[PDB]
Amino acid sequence: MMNLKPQTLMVAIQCVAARTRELDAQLQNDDPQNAAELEQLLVGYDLAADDLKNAYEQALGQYSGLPPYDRLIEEP
């Protein structure tokens, strides 16, 4: 039940967004490797991303000066 620190939330959000773009790039490759498995992972990454985003929207009211959420998830 503890909260995560806002700094932790930024690191996690940026990390999962990058991993998500990495797997999307693989899947759009001409002859894809392990597609079923990448799609299963991506379900999980999206759920984690959505949960992080909710926690960050709380942080924005509590810790000053944080970037807008759309900046953290920018490509790049």
Q: Given the rule CB under 8 A, which residues bind its own copies?
A: 1-5, 7-8, 11-12, 15-16, 18-19, 44-45, 47-48, 51-52, 54-55, 58-59, 62
Q: How far is the CB of 66 from its own copies (least distance, A)?
A: 14
d(CA 49, CA 15): 10
Q: How far is CA 74 from CA 19, 56, 62, in A?
A: 13, 15, 23
Instruction: State the minimum distance, in angstroms, from the CB of residue 34 to its own copies.
Output: 17
CB of 32 to its own copies, least distance (A): 21
Interatomic CA distance for residues 70 and 63, integer angstroms: 17
Q: Are 16 and 69 in contact (CB under 8 A)?
A: no
